Amino acid sequence: QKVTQAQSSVSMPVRKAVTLNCLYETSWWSYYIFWYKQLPSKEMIFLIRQGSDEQNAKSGRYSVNFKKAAKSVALTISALQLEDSAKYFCALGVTGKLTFGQGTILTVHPNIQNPDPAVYQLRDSKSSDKSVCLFTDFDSQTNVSQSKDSDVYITDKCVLDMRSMDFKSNSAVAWSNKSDFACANAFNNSIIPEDTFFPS
Amino acid sequence: VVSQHPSRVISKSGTSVKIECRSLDFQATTMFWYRQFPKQSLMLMATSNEGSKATYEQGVEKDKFLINHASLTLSTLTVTSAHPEDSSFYICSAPGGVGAFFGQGTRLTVVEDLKNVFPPEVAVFEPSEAEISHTQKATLVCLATGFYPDHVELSWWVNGKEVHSGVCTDPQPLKEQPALNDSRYALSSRLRVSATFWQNPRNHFRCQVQFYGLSENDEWTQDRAKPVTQIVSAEAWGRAD
Helix, strand or coil: CEEECCCCEEEEECCCCEEECCEEECCCCCCEEEEEEECCCCCEEEEEEEECCCCCCEECCEEEEEECCCCEEEEEECCCCHHHCEEEEEEEEECCEEEECCCEEEEEECCCCCCCCEEEECCCCCCCCCEEEEEECCCCCCCCCCCCCCCEEECCCCEECCCCCCCCCCEEEEEECCCCCCHHHHCCCCCCCCCCECCC | CEEEECCEEEEECCCCEEEEEEECCCCCCEEEEEEECCCCCEEEEEEEECCCCCEECCCCCCCCEEEEEEECCEEEEEECCCCHHHCEEEEEEEECCCCEEECCCEEEEEECCHHHCECCEEEEECCCHHHHHHHCEEEEEEEEEEEECCCEEEEEEECCEEECCCEEECCCCEECCCCCCCCCEEEEEEEEEEHHHHCCCCCEEEEEEEECCECCCCCCCCCCCCCECEEEEEEEECCCC
């Protein structure tokens, strides 16, 4: 048995729909496909089950596009909410025993009508030797690349608190204790808008 | 519901680590044991069965992992001669329902020595004046660094009340040295408020980082403070200038 979730991460704004792909391989004639979401606690939450001999599954906001010949069983989540940000797993179940995919991390983003991408230099903390750069107000589809220097740390884009109801914004941070570290070049490994603001 | 015990455990290498899977309000003659290494899939290890021998999956050493069906409501998994390579997430399940009933899992951390356990260092960074001028908004940054194991919970507290608006946190902790097996971790979060709220010297901002560490019963010989389960915070007052 094999379950393939080729996408490691996907970003989509609130109120939109998102499709998470899953491909499987099985020699069995009768089986089930399950979709679970794994919460930050690492708890597994049931979303939907697709039977090998059934029509397209539906449960709450979840639906499955079951392409049996293609052994494709994509999950669509409709009307996305901030609480939907989690890691989603596709699993193939034969006699209770499950085979899982690698999982796909879905980040649900706020609707940013007026992106204002910018990189800000923060004041040094009198309690830390770390210099911090904040990349903020960029749009959902911005990809933040990892550092290519062991002495420079760069986070991915953050996940908004699911109960947030204000000052909603996408951001990443970069920090270092290197003498030469500057915010002007900290996020160079990323492809960013030509109008990103870099204040002096 | 299926309940696992313990939820978390930090064990010394060479010890026997027992993990329990209990079916509450129902009986299970069969229980499944899964293992998940970080950023990897859940993999079936073994199947516990009432009145018969445990079934083991390919590559699972029967000598290293003892599976036992103790009763019609209990299945146990024993990590014999625990090694740091055994550090993983162990989750059990029992048949029943559309899916299966899953336990909440066990975060097993195996350390060569309890001195490999480090709490987070927590720092707060104040809003940039350039951000305030450009957007009339003010973002605080919290950094939690050098902790091991990678399990922390970060929250923001304004004037002694937890806040959720304007809060955005890293999906997962960052491996400080990705190429090192003994790497420590870091995590960041942001809190955005209006510049008017930030510029009030009466407002209090605190980033709280809960860390799961050593138990009260655990041995400690180092000069540094015993890294027990604790809260590490960083704070700042509003700034009128």
